[PDB]
Design an enzyme around this catalytic site. Structure first.
Site, PDB file in Angstrom:
ATOM      1  N   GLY A 240      24.917   3.257   0.251  1.00 51.64           N
ATOM      2  CA  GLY A 240      26.128   2.616   0.708  1.00 51.64           C
ATOM      3  C   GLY A 240      25.879   1.469   1.671  1.00 51.64           C
ATOM      4  O   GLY A 240      26.810   0.726   1.991  1.00 51.64           O
TER       5      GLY A 240
ATOM      6  N   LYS B 106       0.814  -1.214   0.000  1.00 48.29           N
ATOM      7  CA  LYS B 106       0.000   0.000   0.000  1.00 48.29           C
ATOM      8  C   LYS B 106       0.847   1.264   0.000  1.00 48.29           C
ATOM      9  O   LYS B 106       0.339   2.343  -0.401  1.00 48.29           O
ATOM     10  CB  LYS B 106      -0.964  -0.002   1.215  1.00 48.29           C
ATOM     11  N   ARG B 107       2.104   1.143   0.412  1.00 45.73           N
ATOM     12  CA  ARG B 107       2.975   2.314   0.425  1.00 45.73           C
ATOM     13  C   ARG B 107       3.714   2.455  -0.885  1.00 45.73           C
ATOM     14  O   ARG B 107       4.367   3.489  -1.095  1.00 45.73           O
ATOM     15  CB  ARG B 107       4.040   2.232   1.503  1.00 45.73           C
ATOM     16  N   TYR B 108       3.723   1.377  -1.693  1.00 48.96           N
ATOM     17  CA  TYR B 108       4.485   1.275  -2.947  1.00 48.96           C
ATOM     18  C   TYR B 108       3.576   0.769  -4.102  1.00 48.96           C
ATOM     19  O   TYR B 108       3.912  -0.266  -4.700  1.00 48.96           O
ATOM     20  CB  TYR B 108       5.693   0.407  -2.766  1.00 48.96           C
ATOM     21  N   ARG B 109       2.514   1.506  -4.410  1.00 51.46           N
ATOM     22  CA  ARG B 109       1.495   1.015  -5.337  1.00 51.46           C
ATOM     23  C   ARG B 109       2.022   1.022  -6.768  1.00 51.46           C
ATOM     24  O   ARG B 109       1.344   0.486  -7.631  1.00 51.46           O
ATOM     25  CB  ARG B 109       0.225   1.835  -5.233  1.00 51.46           C
TER      26      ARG B 109
ATOM     27  N   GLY C  18      23.383  -4.454   0.024  1.00 51.60           N
ATOM     28  CA  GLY C  18      24.178  -5.677   0.025  1.00 51.60           C
ATOM     29  C   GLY C  18      24.490  -6.184   1.399  1.00 51.60           C
ATOM     30  O   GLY C  18      24.770  -7.410   1.555  1.00 51.60           O
TER      31      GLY C  18
HETATM   32  C1  LIG Z   1      26.784   6.882  -2.867  1.00 52.50           C
HETATM   33  C2  LIG Z   1      27.604   5.623  -2.685  1.00 52.50           C
HETATM   34  N1  LIG Z   1      28.899   5.814  -2.314  1.00 52.50           N
HETATM   35  C3  LIG Z   1      29.704   4.736  -2.141  1.00 52.50           C
HETATM   36  N2  LIG Z   1      31.054   4.944  -1.757  1.00 52.50           N
HETATM   37  C4  LIG Z   1      29.233   3.427  -2.299  1.00 52.50           C
HETATM   38  C5  LIG Z   1      27.909   3.265  -2.685  1.00 52.50           C
HETATM   39  C6  LIG Z   1      27.059   4.374  -2.881  1.00 52.50           C
HETATM   40  C7  LIG Z   1      25.660   4.138  -3.280  1.00 52.50           C
HETATM   41  C8  LIG Z   1      24.623   4.862  -3.943  1.00 52.50           C
HETATM   42  N3  LIG Z   1      23.475   4.116  -4.072  1.00 52.50           N
HETATM   43  N4  LIG Z   1      23.860   2.942  -3.511  1.00 52.50           N
HETATM   44  C9  LIG Z   1      23.027   1.739  -3.435  1.00 52.50           C
HETATM   45  C10 LIG Z   1      22.884   1.204  -4.878  1.00 52.50           C
HETATM   46  C11 LIG Z   1      24.209   1.125  -5.616  1.00 52.50           C
HETATM   47  C12 LIG Z   1      25.233   0.078  -5.212  1.00 52.50           C
HETATM   48  C13 LIG Z   1      24.466  -0.081  -6.510  1.00 52.50           C
HETATM   49  C14 LIG Z   1      21.736   1.896  -2.645  1.00 52.50           C
HETATM   50  C15 LIG Z   1      20.482   2.157  -3.158  1.00 52.50           C
HETATM   51  C16 LIG Z   1      19.365   2.245  -2.324  1.00 52.50           C
HETATM   52  C17 LIG Z   1      19.556   2.067  -0.960  1.00 52.50           C
HETATM   53  C18 LIG Z   1      18.394   2.095  -0.027  1.00 52.50           C
HETATM   54  C19 LIG Z   1      17.609   3.243   0.231  1.00 52.50           C
HETATM   55  N5  LIG Z   1      17.816   4.430  -0.480  1.00 52.50           N
HETATM   56  C20 LIG Z   1      16.943   5.159  -1.217  1.00 52.50           C
HETATM   57  N6  LIG Z   1      17.559   6.234  -1.663  1.00 52.50           N
HETATM   58  N7  LIG Z   1      18.840   6.143  -1.183  1.00 52.50           N
HETATM   59  N8  LIG Z   1      19.017   5.046  -0.451  1.00 52.50           N
HETATM   60  C21 LIG Z   1      16.515   3.222   1.086  1.00 52.50           C
HETATM   61  C22 LIG Z   1      16.206   2.029   1.743  1.00 52.50           C
HETATM   62  C23 LIG Z   1      16.966   0.859   1.497  1.00 52.50           C
HETATM   63 CL1  LIG Z   1      16.616  -0.634   2.256  1.00 52.50          CL
HETATM   64  C24 LIG Z   1      18.059   0.919   0.648  1.00 52.50           C
HETATM   65  F1  LIG Z   1      18.820  -0.210   0.384  1.00 52.50           F
HETATM   66  C25 LIG Z   1      20.832   1.828  -0.491  1.00 52.50           C
HETATM   67  N9  LIG Z   1      21.893   1.761  -1.327  1.00 52.50           N
HETATM   68  O1  LIG Z   1      23.036   1.502  -0.804  1.00 52.50           O
HETATM   69  C26 LIG Z   1      25.124   2.911  -3.032  1.00 52.50           C
END
Ligand SMILES: Cc1nc(N)ccc1-c1cnn([C@H](CC2CC2)c2ccc(-c3c(-n4cnnn4)ccc(Cl)c3F)c[n+]2[O-])c1
Length: 236
Positions: A186, A160-163, A189
């Site tokens: 970050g 419901k939060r992600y329709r 994984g």
């Molecule tokens: C900036 C940077 N600097 C480094 N040196 C190393 C890596 C990165 C970097 C930038 N994005 N990401 C990853 C994806 C990418 C590895 C492929 C990512 C995407 C989404 C989320 C996330 C969110 N988010 C929504 N909006 N933001 N976060 C919200 C909830 C949950 Cl549960 C989540 F998992 C977390 N991460 O990590 C890593």
């Protein structure tokens, strides 16, 4: 991690930091030790990765500042991404790293159990997300590994939060209705680790969300229990 606090040495001994070394060395993603030769992480982490030659797995690390040119690391022999993975928000966000040799386990580098056969209908109430990620949407990688306790959300509420997305049984959501604690950039994984009967289980892999810690927008995680057969097949 938004709304979290610093960990101490030895506290999360299955957590690794996966570094890339192209074009320069930096933390890329979190991961979890699940065997002497095996790390479980997110497939989306490998979007820009040309091959396993450029990866380094560091275990036993509390502070990113501990890693120097003589710090030992493990090379990656193979990256195994799920064959149905397309993008984090549509699921299958899971990968195994096979290391070049076997981790001898020590106090600082230990395995976490997969969710156990017989536990499919356990209600986990003690779950934590950990990582070196941002503390808010525009921030920086943190030096000290951070932790936050976050409650699981039902798939019904999460949908419901992600329709605009398909929330399936292969995902698990976690977060507060008021927001304020969540994974952020970050942390993907790494583990969503839940303790049950004083044993830690790897319940989720940090995957995606709308913003970080926003009201009524929980984080979304790969539901590891739904991938156990895939893991066992690949590791055997
Ligand atoms: C900036 C940077 N600097 C480094 N040196 C190393 C890596 C990165 C970097 C930038 N994005 N990401 C990853 C994806 C990418 C590895 C492929 C990512 C995407 C989404 C989320 C996330 C969110 N988010 C929504 N909006 N933001 N976060 C919200 C909830 C949950 Cl549960 C989540 F998992 C977390 N991460 O990590 C890593």
């Amino acid at each position: 991690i938004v709304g979290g606090t610093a960990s101490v040495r030895g506290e999360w001994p299955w957590q690794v930091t996966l570094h890339t070394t192209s074009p320069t060395q930096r933390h890329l993603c979190g991961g979890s030790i699940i065997g002497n030769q095996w790390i479980l992480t997110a497939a989306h982490c490998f979007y820009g990765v040309e091959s396993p030659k450029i990866l380094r797995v560091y275990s036993g690390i509390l502070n990113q500042s501990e890693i120097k040119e003589d710090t030992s690391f493990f090379g990656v022999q193979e990256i195994i991404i799920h064959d149905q993975y397309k993008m984090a928000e549509s699921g299958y966000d899971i990968a195994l790293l096979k290391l070049e040799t076997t981790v001898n386990y020590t106090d600082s580098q230990r395995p976490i159990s997969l969710p156990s056969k017989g536990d499919r209908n356990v209600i986990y109430t003690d779950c934590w997300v950990t990582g070196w990620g941002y503390r808010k949407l525009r921030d920086k990688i943190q030096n000290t590994l951070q932790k936050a306790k976050i409650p699981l959300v039902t798939n019904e509420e999460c949908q419901k939060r992600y329709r605009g997305h398909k929330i399936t049984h292969k995902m698990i959501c976690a977060g507060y209705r008021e927001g304020g604690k969540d994974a952020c950039k970050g942390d993907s994984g790494g583990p969503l680790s839940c303790k049950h009967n004083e044993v830690w289980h790897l319940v989720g892999i940090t995957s995606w969300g709308e913003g970080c810690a926003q009201r009524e927008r929980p984080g979304v995680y790969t539901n590891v229990v739904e991938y156990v057969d895939w893991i066992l097949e690949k590791t055997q």
